[PDB]
Amino acid sequence: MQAATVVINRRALRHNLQRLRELAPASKMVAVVKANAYGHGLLETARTLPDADAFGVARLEEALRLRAGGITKPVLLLEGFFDARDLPTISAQHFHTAVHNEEQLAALEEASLDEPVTVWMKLDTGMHRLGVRPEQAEAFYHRLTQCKNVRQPVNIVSHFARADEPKCGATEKQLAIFNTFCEGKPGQRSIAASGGILLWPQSHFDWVRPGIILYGVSALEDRSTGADFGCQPVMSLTSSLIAVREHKAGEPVGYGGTWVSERDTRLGVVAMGYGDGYPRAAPSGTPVLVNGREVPIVGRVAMDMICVDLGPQAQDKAGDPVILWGEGLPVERIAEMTKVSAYELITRLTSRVAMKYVD
Amino acid sequence: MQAATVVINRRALRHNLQRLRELAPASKMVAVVKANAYGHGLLETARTLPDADAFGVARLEEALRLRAGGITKPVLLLEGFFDARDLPTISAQHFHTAVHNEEQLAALEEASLDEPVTVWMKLDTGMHRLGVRPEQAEAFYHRLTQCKNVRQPVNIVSHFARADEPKCGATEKQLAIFNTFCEGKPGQRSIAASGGILLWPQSHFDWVRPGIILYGVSALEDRSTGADFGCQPVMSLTSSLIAVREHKAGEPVGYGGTWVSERDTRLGVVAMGYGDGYPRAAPSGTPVLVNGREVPIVGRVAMDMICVDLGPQAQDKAGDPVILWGEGLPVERIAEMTKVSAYELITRLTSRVAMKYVD
Ligand SMILES: *Cc1c(COP(=O)(O)O)cnc(C)c1O
Numbered sequence: 046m047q048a049a050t051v052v053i054n055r056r057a058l059r060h061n062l063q064r065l066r067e068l069a070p071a072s073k074m075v076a077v078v079k080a081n082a083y084g085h086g087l088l089e090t091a092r093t094l095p096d097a098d099a100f101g102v103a104r105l106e107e108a109l110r111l112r113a114g115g116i117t118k119p120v121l122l123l124e125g126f127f128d129a130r131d132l133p134t135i136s137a138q139h140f141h142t143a144v145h146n147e148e149q150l151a152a153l154e155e156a157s158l159d160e161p162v163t164v165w166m167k168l169d170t171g172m173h174r175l176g177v178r179p180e181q182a183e184a185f186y187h188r189l190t191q192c193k194n195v196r197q198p199v200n201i202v203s204h205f206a207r208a209d210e211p212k213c214g215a216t217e218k219q220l221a222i223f224n225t226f227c228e229g230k231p232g233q234r235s236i237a238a239s240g241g242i243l244l245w246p247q248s249h250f251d252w253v254r255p256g257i258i259l260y261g262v263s264a265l266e267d268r269s270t271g272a273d274f275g276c277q278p279v280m281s282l283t284s285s286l287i288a289v290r291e292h293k294a295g296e297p298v299g300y301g302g303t304w305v306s307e308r309d310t311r312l313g314v315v316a317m318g319y320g321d322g323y324p325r326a327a328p329s330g331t332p333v334l335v336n337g338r339e340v341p342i343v344g345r346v347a348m349d350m351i352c353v354d355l356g357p358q359a360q361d362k363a364g365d366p367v368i369l370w371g372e373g374l375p376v377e378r379i380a381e382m383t384k385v386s387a388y389e390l391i392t393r394l395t396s397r398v399a400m401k402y403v404d
Numbered sequence: 405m406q407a408a409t410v411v412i413n414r415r416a417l418r419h420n421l422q423r424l425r426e427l428a429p430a431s432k433m434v435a436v437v438k439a440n441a442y443g444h445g446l447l448e449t450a451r452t453l454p455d456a457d458a459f460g461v462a463r464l465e466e467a468l469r470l471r472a473g474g475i476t477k478p479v480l481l482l483e484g485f486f487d488a489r490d491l492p493t494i495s496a497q498h499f500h501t502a503v504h505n506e507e508q509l510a511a512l513e514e515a516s517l518d519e520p521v522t523v524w525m526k527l528d529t530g531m532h533r534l535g536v537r538p539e540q541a542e543a544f545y546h547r548l549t550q551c552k553n554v555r556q557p558v559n560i561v562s563h564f565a566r567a568d569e570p571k572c573g574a575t576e577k578q579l580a581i582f583n584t585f586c587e588g589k590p591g592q593r594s595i596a597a598s599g600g601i602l603l604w605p606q607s608h609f610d611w612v613r614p615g616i617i618l619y620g621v622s623a624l625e626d627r628s629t630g631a632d633f634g635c636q637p638v639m640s641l642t643s644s645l646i647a648v649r650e651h652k653a654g655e656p657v658g659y660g661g662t663w664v665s666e667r668d669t670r671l672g673v674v675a676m677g678y679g680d681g682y683p684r685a686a687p688s689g690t691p692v693l694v695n696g697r698e699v700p701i702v703g704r705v706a707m708d709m710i711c712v713d714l715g716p717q718a719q720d721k722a723g724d725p726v727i728l729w730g731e732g733l734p735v736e737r738i739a740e741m742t743k744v745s746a747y748e749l750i751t752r753l754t755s756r757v758a759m760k761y762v763d
């Protein structure tokens with residue numbers, strides 16, 4: 046292929062897992078690979094990290110897509126199970142699960158399984174998304190230690206809502222609540238994801254759950270990159286030019302003739318659009334690398350194409366290599382220029398994009 | 405349980421192709437199915453419309469994937485071919501192609517094919533994206549009529565840049581240029597897509613290329629839906645609740661504490677996020693149907709989850725049906741609320757979303 050392609054550096058992936066073990070030296074690793082491993086490929090990303098202590102996924106479907114591919118490490122269902130009739134599979138597949146509601150707990154109480162299941166009680170410490178609230182947590186917790194269907198001890202998990210904002214006291218407050226509930230309880234503790242790992246060493250505890258930073262991308266919006274933490278970028282969104290055309294001063298480009306040129310120039314057309322996952326919101330001027338040289342996007346990003354300004358005697362030609370982000374272009378730069386989160390940029394890509402794996 | 409799923413109404417798809425034949429009664433139909441048929445499924449959308457005169461795709465890959473699935477109809481390569489070594493496949497697969505540059509034409513000229521290929525010369529009439537400029541078009545055109553590898557006559561294609569803006573004279577100008585070049589030439593003429601079909605009956609000519617409106621969605625941003633033109637919505641983006649929790653006044657929700665409740669209420673958590681293709685940009689208040697009942701999104705949309713405000717004694721519960729857009733909730737309405745183009749909303753979805761076909 047020469048069009049929409051994501052190149053995944055397996056070497057950078059391994060480097061990052063090891064680099065994260067250096068940053069959180071007393072904690073085991075839950076490699077978070079939900080949403081097709083953040084756009085890098087669920088199964089391939091797991092196979093690249095046979096050293097991971099466990100893998101984290103959002104849904105049950107993802108966890109078995111892993112077992113189907115031969116992945117054997119423990120897989121953590123971060124949101125738990127959505128149907129009580131799933132417990133038998135989860136037990137047999139040796140999936141570890143979070144438990145945040147009455148339905149899940151009552152399911153565990155009355156299920157009949159050939160083996161007990163390892164569980165992580167999800168505690169709501171401030172995010173107010175999933176989890177048992179503090180005032181209901183002690184009773185809920187106690188019922189889990191009385192389950193013979195639950196492998197003792199009951200582990201405790203939680204998640205930060207604003208760890209990337211060190212100067213609001215949100216994280217210290219969640220930590221305060223997390224610590225109060227865990228006092229005197231056995232079982233592993235886990236509350237830190239990318240942000241908690243890098244900015245809060247007092248939240249590492251027993252297990253940390255690296256997601257975005259595992260792929261060498263930064264968790265915060267302070268324009269820092271994965272390299273700020275010694276992590277190497279894994280993904281490169283690439284394509285090729287399918288046309289190099291003459292253009293003249295005063296002439297508009299794209300839908301809504303929205304960019305107008307102030308000079309005679311040459312425009313390049315890239316085989317990349319939002320039908321591939323590239324943000325339609327990308328404003329003119331956003332950087333793209335053409336033949337390893339940065340050129341600006343001019344005009345509205347279409348479903349399948351993107352126009353760039355090369356210059357009046359630019360000698361680029363149809364077929365030449367284009368990098369949407371990658372080596373000369375961290376996805377974090379593209380997120381600042383487009384105002385789109387790096388999390389969304391690397392993850393919201395379509396099945397039209399080819400996948401390559403190197404090293 | 406059910407999670408992220410796109411339900412495709414085959415009946416509505418059929419209705420729209422006919423309805424468009426009623427709006428452009430003297431023109432053949434090029435069903436545009438590029439980018440996985442605008443998120444509806446490339447092969448299934450083609451199989452639902454065996455009545456289409458032809459199918460349009462962005463890339464050669466998409467056309468070949470149609471032939472692989474048993475689609476037998478003529479397929480139009482809207483951007484042409486990117487490599488000269490592709491001509492033999494194009495010829496053998498009976499793919500019709502656009503020709504916009506020197507490389508493609510020179511390729512046609514010196515290739516040796518067992519059969520000639522049907523071609524549509526792409527003329528740049530104002531969009532300044534792809535196509536031969538007016539002052540180079542006559543010479544370029546004449547070389548195509550002299551090709552042994554091109555099945556005569558040479559057809560002429562072009563595309564509108566601002567057909568959804570009837571008040572600016574952009575479309576009349578492109579039409580003026582298109583008409584001047586086609587004078588005295590045989591061969592089919594085609595310049596109209598969804599907008600040209602609905603708003604410009606002078607631009608129908610021989611072939612019209614319905615894309616977005618084929619799926620019952622409006623090409624415009626004037627709070628018009630597909631129903632404004634008698635076209636029925638084909639896609640519904642659905643999911644289910646995975647939690648219904650108590651929440652209290654003054655408490656924030658989601659990442660960044662973006663939302664704070666002014667009352668004790670109950671929050672619902674949807675198994676839908678941008679890891680599925682739902683816009684991360686969706687602001688609190690964006691409508692979502694829970695049990696058929698519109699509720700607002702509260703807090704930032706995460707990779708796998710979305711929180712909604714149900715009410716203090718709302719009786720919704722984990723497992724209940726949620727509609728992100730669909731029947732009751734046109735994708736247009738969501739586009740208006742989120743400020744994201746309906747084109748991108750239905751198209752930029754990930755492979756995590758299941759596909760269902762009804763009728
Ligand atoms: C997805 C998620 C993570 C990883 O988050 P990052 O910000 O990419 O580090 C960890 N834990 C939970 C509970 C999550 O849902």
Ligand SMILES: *Cc1c(COP(=O)(O)O)cnc(C)c1O
Nearest residue numbers: 436482563597598613614615616
């Ligand atoms: C995608 C495309 C279409 C369809 O346009 P809509 O506005 O979605 O109908 C038709 N023709 C060409 C050249 C295209 O690239």
